[PDB]
Amino acid sequence: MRIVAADTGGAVLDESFQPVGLIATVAVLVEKPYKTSKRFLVKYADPYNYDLSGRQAIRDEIELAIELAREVSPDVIHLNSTLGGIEVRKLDESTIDALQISDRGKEIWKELSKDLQPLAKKFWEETGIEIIAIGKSSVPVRIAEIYAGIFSVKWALDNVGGLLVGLPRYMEVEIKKDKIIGKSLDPREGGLYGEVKTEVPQGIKWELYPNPLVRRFMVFEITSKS
Amino acid sequence: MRIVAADTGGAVLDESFQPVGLIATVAVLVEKPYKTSKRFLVKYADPYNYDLSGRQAIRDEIELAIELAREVSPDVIHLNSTLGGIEVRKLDESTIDALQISDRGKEIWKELSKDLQPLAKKFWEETGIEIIAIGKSSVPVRIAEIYAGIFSVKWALDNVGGLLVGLPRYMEVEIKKDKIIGKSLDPREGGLYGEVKTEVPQGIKWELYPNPLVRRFMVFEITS
Amino acid sequence: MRIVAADTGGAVLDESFQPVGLIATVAVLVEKPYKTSKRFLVKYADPYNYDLSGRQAIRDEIELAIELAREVSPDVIHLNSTLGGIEVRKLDESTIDALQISDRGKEIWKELSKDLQPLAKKFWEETGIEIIAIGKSSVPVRIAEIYAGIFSVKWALDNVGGLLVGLPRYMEVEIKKDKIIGKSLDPREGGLYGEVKTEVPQGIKWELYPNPLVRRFMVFEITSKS
DNA sequence: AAAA
DNA sequence: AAAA
DNA sequence: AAAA
């Protein structure tokens, strides 16, 4: 099967490792063997003017996903929200309460459905393609998340005297002359990876290391040789 | 310590990666250093006539484990159900209510005890060996699960014009000229593996890749 | 950031892999890149006269961390307890009930607070350093745990006709000629490790293998050649 | 629910 | 809450 | 509870 998925991830961190704002929203097309993506879109946010409790991320995710989906016509869209695979077009207050989720999760999504449910309904009317909230269960979602990490590092390289990027969960990045590679650190996932072309700037040093306050998350730090 | 454990696993999947039915029930003997098994039994189900919500799996498991136990006389039997290590022979509705599990889990075992508890009682009487529901905690149970995976692939090799097999959680298989090797993909488990001798047919291609719908589960695909 | 963390870990096991008692309490200093510690303290317990239930451990940990902290003046102390990051000086009957932890945990810490809360208060008054119950989230706590493992093996080597050591969760140890190395087995953690100097006695053999009754925990076993 |  |  |  052919799947379009999206995720928002990558954060600017302050010096005590507290998130300031998110960076990259990515939509990816994933096909067999479901390890990477060769066709994807990115939209950068402004992390210094970001509402971390604003939940603009998922609105960005579905729009980018639909934009990619219109170009490549997948079998399904995977949205990063763990609701058990329920179709977003079937999302009303009735079906939300029946979900096996937290009370906070139910109230976040009753408010979100007001824009997203009509969006998904119209896209389905147009194409027959469902938008499903599968979240943690989805491999395409994890691949989008890996790419959000890569594009965040690409963003950091392009916008740096010092920057701390908090990567999405247990992934690493590698810097090469003409590209950035991102890989899951979890071998249980079966070797998920991504790769993006970019020019790596001069006069900067970088390091990748564990976030001391959030175990299994890495930090990518850029410093100027100044 | 010498342990017999059992598990059912491996599923035939349709073209949209949905499970059709389970394949292999395996009982293993596990001994020090507790990384693999050299002595085991397999039972094949019919995945095309299987009730996934039917729980013949756990019934198959205890029977097979008992069959193996009678032959190799272990210290204990491990059953793949996470109930905190309570003896199956001591499982009645009284002790079931006290178990710290979901009510769905409670209603499942109220039904199961009716058959299994007398069996465990009878088996304990004969041998002194306990049958304990330990599940996720047991390394022998995970080694059986890995073997279930290997045997599912063997099943795939024996019945292939094209098949998709969903393996148990995060394990890989490698096919060599005369055998199938299965390994946990989780280095935290400390290097669990299994190996089965089988004849590999000619004229086939196979591939192993992530189930796109079930993260950390792999798919084994084989074509003629 | 500079962090002091502490943990109690390592157990003597009987022949059927049941824990008899714990071995090592360690405080560690962790600095960038937050993968290991080069400065640490250990206190060994008597595993054969130990009350597993319990809580002499946390008392030892906070004492040991304060002792290390006085020497190295960290930014914060992490105690191995997952309470959401609440300062131990702020632990009273009111705030303990507000914690999203089990009813068992709440009644336990109302008892612990009577000794620990004044201790953290006095230390904060003196230095401005908070002692926080962060637990599972802290990389420094995980590094302390690894060191607890290493020191537990050192203890076994120094006190061994046969010993079984149950290590902390998913870590391995390597014996070298003049030292013991400990490593996390989880690559998602980003390569956490430790190293402790010791003399390896003669006339003994060792093996590392899975604890069959506790999945993802390893056993370090020592046997005499006599 | 999501984020580091 | 912690421990193997 | 188990299965992918």
Numbering used by the authors:
A (entry chain A), C (entry chain C): 1 to 160, 164 to 229
B (entry chain E): 1 to 160, 164 to 227
Published text:
Here, we report the crystal structures of PhoExo I, which shares 76% amino acid sequence identity with PfuExo I. In this study, we determined three substrate-free structures of PhoExo I and four structures of PhoExo I in complexes with ssDNAs.
To prevent the degradation of ssDNA during the cocrystallization, we used the D80N mutant of PhoExo I; the corresponding mutation was previously utilized in a cocrystallization study of the B. halodurans RNase HI―DNA/RNA hybrid complex. In this study, we determined the crystal structures of PhoExo I in complexes with poly-dA, poly-dC and poly-dT at 2.05 Å, 2.50 Å and 2.05 Å, respectively. Although the overall structures of the PhoExo I―ssDNA complexes were nearly identical, PhoExo I formed some base-specific interactions with ssDNAs. In addition, the base groups of the poly-dC and poly-dT formed direct hydrogen bonds with Arg55 and Arg104, and they formed water-mediated hydrogen bonds with Phe17 and Asn214. Because the active sites of the PhoExo I trimer are covered by the flexible α2 and α3 helices, it is hard to recruit structurally rigid or partially structured ssDNA to the active sites. PhoExo I may disfavour structurally rigid poly-dA as a substrate. The PhoExo I―ssDNA structures determined in this study are predicted to present the distributive cleavage state of PhoExo I. In this state, PhoExo I recognizes ssDNA only at the active site pocket that accommodates the 3′-OH terminal 4 nt of ssDNA, so the 5′-terminal 3 nt are disordered in the complex structures.
